Swiss-Prot record, chains A, B:
Annotated gene: menE
GO molecular function: ATP binding; CoA-ligase activity; o-succinylbenzoate-CoA ligase activity
Name this polypeptide is given: 2-succinylbenzoate--CoA ligase
Substrates-to-products reaction catalysed: 2-succinylbenzoate + ATP + CoA = 2-succinylbenzoyl-CoA + AMP + diphosphate
Lineage start: Bacteria, Bacillati, Bacillota, Bacilli, Bacillales
InterPro entries documented for this protein: AMP-bd_C (IPR025110), AMP-bd_C_sf (IPR045851), AMP-binding_CS (IPR020845), AMP-dep_synth/lig_dom (IPR000873), ANL_N_sf (IPR042099), ATP-dep_AMP-bd_enzyme (IPR050237), MenE (IPR010192)
Xref: Pfam families: AMP-binding, AMP-binding_C
Pathway annotation from the record: Quinol/quinone metabolism; 1,4-dihydroxy-2-naphthoate biosynthesis; 1,4-dihydroxy-2-naphthoate from chorismate: step 5/7; Quinol/quinone metabolism; menaquinone biosynthesis
EC primary class: ligase
Keyword Nucleotide-binding: yes
Length: 484, 484
């Protein structure tokens, strides 16, 4: 039921091994444990207690890594907040998660959260003296460790409860797939508030593996850092991968794995990576599975071009249509099972009832298996748009647009975009006149920047079926004029 | 609470990878699952049912690997029988374990067991037609998978219940310690009825790693097999390591890990291996921990010479004397904890109550921890003699000797042996005269070869404490004459 705290045990086993490279800082596992314990001590002085929930709002920094581990050492659930959200979106997640604390810094406006939660500046925190405490020496396998919001298909996101067991099994199953050696070093340049970034911190302490951490993604900095630090592993969404190949015809020799996830990649990009020797491992995974649950090796990447691979060890996948399992190549809903699959959504009894069916999680994605069991994800959802690896839910964007008094009805769908893959376009029926600029200013207070419509169209009615349900796939073809 | 059957998933994932090389003949994971399923179907036709217990009595052969997996595919607990035991010793274990079946071959005297268990000849079995069955597609993590007998300190051994979860976590923790790559291959030339050998079969399917299986250990054949099949990993007890060093001064280039366990090694041997580049990882582990639980890497083998190393990830060790905490360097009983620790001894109420203390397992070994947490096991037991990595319990050997009509009292202690480490000597008080030849003939029917006393001595009294308990340590000193 329990394991020794991973960071604590890792510091006991290999104290001097490097845990984190960040800018000009190198942090050993012994130093990481000491810093996380000290932050935990300072948090306990601000009355944080075992069983509490603490939200984290930070850019990728060493201090963010300390805060996550410090929560674990106190027995406190960590809510990872997306730094690009508007205040309005964060406030809902602070309230819905039951967070009693917000750990952030001066680059965010702490004042507008004072009413809901006790706000703590991580940099001022670390300057304070505090009593020593007895830390939580054990992680309970079925306890919720972290919460991440996603799947806003009804208009508001759901908090995914990720257990310590989920994270352990994700890291173990990935190591069984990719192999692990003492020389491996993993570069993380995507957000730590997504499981793509955060999972590397759990791999780090479980494997005893260095993470090279970047605050932002810059191709030139990443190539320099790979060379300076002998990086062997790197995670990317397809936009990042495309930017890398835009920069160089050759992959750095030390890279043995580019773990690609977070949405579909254009086929010519995968073909060019294979032709030029970039060792891309395409993968399929989500917040609910605590990162990858299916991965595709480069040796199959051309024969199975388009596939996300096979399930990781201990994990399982099937394709069902209306509760009947599908034959090979027959399209249906992707359902997954495994020790890395989330406990449940937080405080969403009805969604949990619908999403789980006898131990399997319904993903809401459509796909098929070929006759050797390789997974092919079909890009057919209209309730989800993926831009630069960031999920966007039309129901959320439509809810915000409807709230404007000039707006009678609203529909949002994804438009092709050479850089971002897809971007949201808005389709409106209006009571009163309103310009695109007005609408964009109105959305800025309520939606993260990547969620706001890149184009607006005006219609007399939107396409609906006989049950009055919006037909989002038909928006791009309806009689419309562009709104300026 | 369950995982897909490891062999089934591994065959699904990498069917063409080599699972087993035996007499240089190759078995892929696809072929291994097919042979294991077919033997399971043949066993079901002999009325073997989910929930039964089957004992296995086989030398190291491919068919013994099939049998273990076939049991898993039927949901049957597998009792691994030591092939060196007398018929008498094996009959006790068949009855104690509740085995309904015995899976063996014509190398063994099957007629002796058919009064207690239904005996099945694996070679005859594989020639039979049988109907297809629905195999058990999942392994229950807390269900007992295998039973192995050990710890005969009361005079009869105890059956260790090893769960699927125990074997999974043993394999994962070892991979996290040693690293794992697609090129790794593991050579096993020690009995599959010990967990030293059996654990490699589970590493094999979980990692997707070839096992090179030898029926016996010959140094020249092991060396030829390493270079022929590019072996990288090999398991050994110290007698095996000494034979290797007598044969060659150079370790084969492909070997990256010699995993040493099963008892203490002479320090000049460990120093010589380090001097000549043999990558020896000394370890501490037992049946009850489903193999290694503490291991030491070559980089510390000089500075920590005599150490067993540090606990594997997820595992823990402490030292206690009289239930009190022991400071570093303070001697006490080694106690261990981890997901690889056995469920319990089978139907041994008093032993389970005495051996488990608040979630920790008392090992019966004495040791201490240095100020960096490295474990030093002190060779101090007199209730256990280790001969060539085989455990010998004086209580068992004394019981056999006492049952002889001429024998009034008996005490067995370990004598130094250059080749085997320790061999048993017997110390006897006699009712009537009896020769050493007659006692040896008597012991042939009741004890495995390595357990039989190599020398007998006759005394008028044996060393005993105030409560008339034998003081086995002091037998060596006693006033005695050799019995010819
Ligand atoms: C793609 C990223 C790196 C782009 O950010 P960046 O700021 O560098 O963009 P630039 O090219 O430099 O230009 C900045 C302008 O572009 C805007 N912008 C930035 N991001 C987006 C965006 N997503 N969509 C639309 N616009 C964007 C900026 O606002 C700016 O605009 P201007 O001011 O100039 O006008 C960055 O977005 C990024 O890091 N994306 C990745 C986020 C992510 O990690 N998603 C994955 C989520 N899914 C999961 O975590 C589960 C699957 C998983 O675990 C996984 C995923 C990937 C890899 C591995 C795994 C795994 O299994 O381990
Ligand atoms: C040491 C071995 C290989 C010796 O056997 P072998 O038959 O090859 O000996 P020879 O020198 O060739 O001479 C043959 C005659 O020698 C007699 N004899 C054989 N063995 C012994 C013995 N142990 N003691 C005394 N005499 C012996 C025979 O009479 C033979 O005569 P013939 O009949 O041939 O004419 C062999 O004994 C051996 O394989 N020992 C290892 C057993 C073992 O596996 N012990 C480990 C048990 N402990 C565990 O499994 C838990 C710890 C663990 O998991 C582990 C252990 C080691 C390494 C790694 C791990 C791990 O954690 O994964
Ligand atoms: Ca500053
Ligand atoms: Ca990672
Ligand atoms: Ca893969
Ligand atoms: Ca953005
Ligand atoms: Ca054993
Ligand atoms: Ca007890
Ligand atoms: Mg950038
Ligand atoms: Mg099996
Ligand atoms: Mg019978
Ligand atoms: Mg031999
Ligand atoms: Na691989
Ligand atoms: Na200590």
């Amino acid at each position: 039921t329990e394991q020794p705290n991973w960071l604590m045990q890792r510091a006991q086993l290999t104290p001097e091994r490097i845990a984190l490279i960040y800018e000009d800082q190198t942090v050993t596992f012994a130093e990481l444990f000491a810093a996380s314990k000290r932050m935990a001590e300072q948090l306990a002085a601000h009355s944080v207690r075992k069983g509490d929930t603490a939200a984290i709002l930070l850019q990728n920094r060493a201090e963010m890594v300390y805060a996550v581990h410090a929560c674990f050492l106190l027995g406190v659930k960590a809510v990872l907040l997306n730094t690009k959200l508007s205040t309005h979106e964060r406030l809902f997640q602070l309230e819905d998660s039951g967070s009693g604390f917000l750990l952030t810094d001066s680059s965010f406006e702490k004042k507008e959260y004072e009413h809901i939660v006790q706000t703590i500046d991580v940099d001022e925190l670390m300057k304070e003296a505090a009593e020593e405490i007895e830390i939580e020496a054990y992680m309970q396998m079925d306890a919720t460790a972290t919460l991440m919001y996603t799947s806003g298909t009804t208009g508001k996101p759901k908090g995914v409860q990720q257990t310590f067991g989920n994270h352990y099994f994700s890291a173990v199953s990935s190591a069984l797939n990719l192999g692990i050696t003492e020389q491996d070093r993993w570069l993380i340049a995507l957000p730590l508030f997504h499981i793509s970034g955060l999972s590397a911190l759990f791999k780090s302490v479980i494997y005893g593996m260095t993470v090279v951490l970047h605050q932002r993604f810059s191709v030139s900095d990443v190539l320099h850092s790979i060379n300076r630090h002998e990086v062997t592993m790197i995670s990317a969404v397809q936009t990042m991968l495309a930017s890398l190949l835009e920069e160089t015809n050759r992959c750095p020799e030390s890279i043995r794995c580019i773990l690609l996830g977070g949405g579909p990649a254009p086929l010519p990009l995968l073909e060019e990576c294979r032709e030029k020797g970039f060792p891309v491992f395409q993968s399929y995974g989500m917040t609910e599975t605590c990162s990858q649950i299916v991965t595709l090796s480069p040796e199959f990447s051309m024969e199975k071009l388009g596939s996300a691979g096979k399930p990781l060890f201990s994990c399982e996948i099937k394709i069902e249509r209306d509760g009947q399992v599908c034959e090979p190549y027959e399209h249906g809903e992707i359902m997954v099972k495994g020790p890395n699959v989330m406990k449940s959504y937080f405080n969403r009894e009805s969604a949990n009832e619908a999403s789980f069916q006898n131990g399997w999680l319904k993903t809401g994605d459509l796909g098929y298996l070929d006759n050797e069991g390789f997974l092919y994800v079909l890009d057919r959802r209209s309730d989800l748009i993926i831009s630069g690896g960031e999920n966007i839910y039309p129901a959320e964007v439509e809810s915000v647009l409807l709230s404007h008094p000039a707006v009678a009805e609203a529909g949002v769908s994804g438009a092709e975009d050479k850089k971002w893959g897809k971007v949201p376009h808005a389709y409106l029926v209006l009571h009163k006149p309103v310009s695109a600029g007005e609408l964009t200013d109105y959305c800025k207070e309520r939606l993260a920047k990547y969620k706001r419509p890149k184009k607006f169209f005006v219609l007399d009615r939107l396409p609906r079926n006989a049950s009055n349900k919006l037909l989002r796939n038909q928006l791009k073809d309806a009689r419309k004029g562009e709104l300026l």
